[PDB]
Design a binder for this molecule. Structure first.
Ligand SMILES: [Mg+2]
Ligand SMILES: [Mg+2]
Ligand SMILES: [Mg+2]
Lengths: 238, 238, 238
């Protein structure tokens, strides 16, 4: 429904209870994720659903993050979405093909951020509504029962690196977009640069951002020679 | 059958042919693993089975490591266990759901330490008797045909890191306890500290030890802010 | 059909359109991979098929890399192979058990170098014709849409490390040979030494080479003590 590959790699969360920021987010980013989940406080989600209806963005360049499968919030989200022109939703805590299928006929970006989602990543990616896979390090660690996703130097811990590769491979195996996880340390531009360069080098399509200042960094970040090495060179020229 | 989550994170192997050490092991550790497998020489396993019957420990805080599926030793182990109050066994070289199921009605901690076990980790974790997943680096490398699990600096080699993450994710996907592998270099307290801190940070529930001096180390070892980051902070306070 | 484990660990690609080099490749390496795929230009593949028939090597120590499943080149390759004594083929871009099975009654070394192949590695390894698993970092990154498989220091990027471990585990779970990926930087002998030492330490059986100068490097590259640690020591003595 959307030509997401035609849009650039800089995607930006915007909490949907801040409609006064929607235009700025759309001007700053390649794709805006209007957020009904963790970016919006529980008490503000009804107001976010009204803003979703009242302040429209370009549906060719906007995705809506709904709430998790089986929640009453998700039911309210889908009702609010009915009166919009949006076609593509982002499903947080995505944990099964069935959770993706129950969102048909919408296009779905599955955000894997739990152990069950990682174990089921291939089944989630293969589901007919899926158009992209994302991963989320902080909810992954939280639901695992841990306390940090990164070492002292800022490098991802191993289980986070493992899920990152899992999602990239599952997405690419089924022709889906691959979206890399957000860099929560906004002022850590050095770390974001290295992370987005790393993501682009292995074939992520998108780095998702939580602050508009990260979008320029992402956009900029994105012997024997045999056939694949020449493809690497062509990908660079492109 | 056991409230294993209620016990602390410091689990300690004690070879079952050393009953004179059982009381000391129970006083030193949160949970004792009385070992009928690799901790006991082949010729001493019959004596270990008698000690298992004769010198009981608290079954709320003691697990018995039996021998691998299909071995005559495992058959002897289960016969010896019949006359004990233990309910929970640790299955080494765990390689299929069927190996776990044939131990019903016992509770099972599956110790994955072979390639087949890693490939089948999700099926093993989902098996109805499973209450925990552990991994073992040295038997993993041995059965792969290799010669060391760690680099010169003591860091795990990549296939070991891969299986570690595999077991953590499979355990957590099915609500099982996650047990991190033993640190064979007993006097390497620095390495154990970093390893157990790493394990606790990503949500392992337990670090298993092979010497009681490791238990204190383990017990001690265990921007944009969104919902999961606050859960990280709560997990720390707890 | 071949006692591949009896041969040493140094395998060497030789483009099949260079029959004047076949004898030198056989003398330099433990096993020669006569290449009909990426080592030979599209326009030279018919000449490579004739050289395959005309200049035979020892079939106990020679494997033929054919072209990918579903290609017209692969059909031509199998026709050319009919008039040879070779029994074992290497399948590039191996992506399903069905691709391996359609090569029966030949023995197959599946070369996984795409996301779909990584996701399906266990099914590929378990296929009845499979005798080995290899992985390929450059085609993996190319087909993912990325631009490099290695960081600036030459270390593999994470998705490459992930697929490497995936292939080692899948191969070993089903009793197959495990072949480590080629080191394209031929003059980087230091990096190859560390890489092949790493591969041998975790139980790869083979490091595949693209230049004969790499074969000597590969051949040379290949506390509590419990049962598996003694197996590590025995593997070293052997
Ligand atoms: Mg999240
Ligand atoms: Mg073991
Ligand atoms: Mg290739």
């Amino acid at each position: 429904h959307m030509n997401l590959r035609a849009a650039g790699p800089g995607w930006l969360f915007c909490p949907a209870d801040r409609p006064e920021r929607f235009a700025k987010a759309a001007a700053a980013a390649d794709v805006v994720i209007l957020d009904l989940e963790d970016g919006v406080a529980e008490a503000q989600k009804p107001a976010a659903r009204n803003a979703l209806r009242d302040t429209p963005l370009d549906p060719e360049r906007t995705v809506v993050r709904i709430n998790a499968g089986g929640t009453a919030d998700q039911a309210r989200d889908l009702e609010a979405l009915a009166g919009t022109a949006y076609t593509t939703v982002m499903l947080p805590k995505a944990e099964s093909a069935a959770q993706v299928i129950e969102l048909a006929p919408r296009d779905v970006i599955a955000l894997v951020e739990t152990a069950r989602g990682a174990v089921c990543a291939a089944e989630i990616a293969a589901a007919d509504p899926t158009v992209g896979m994302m991963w989320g390090a902080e909810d992954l660690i939280a639901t695992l029962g841990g306390s940090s996703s990164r070492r002292a130097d800022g490098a991802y811990r191993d289980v986070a690196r493992h899920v990152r590769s899992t999602i990239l491979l599952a997405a690419s195996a089924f022709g889906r977009l691959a979206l890399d996880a957000v860099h929560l340390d906004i002022l850590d531009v050095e770390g974001l640069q290295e992370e987005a360069r790393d993501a682009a080098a292995v074939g992520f399509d998108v780095t998702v951002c939580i602050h508009p200042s990260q979008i320029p960094v992402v956009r900029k970040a994105y012997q024997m020679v045999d056939s694949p090495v020449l493809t690497h060179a062509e990908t660079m020229l492109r």
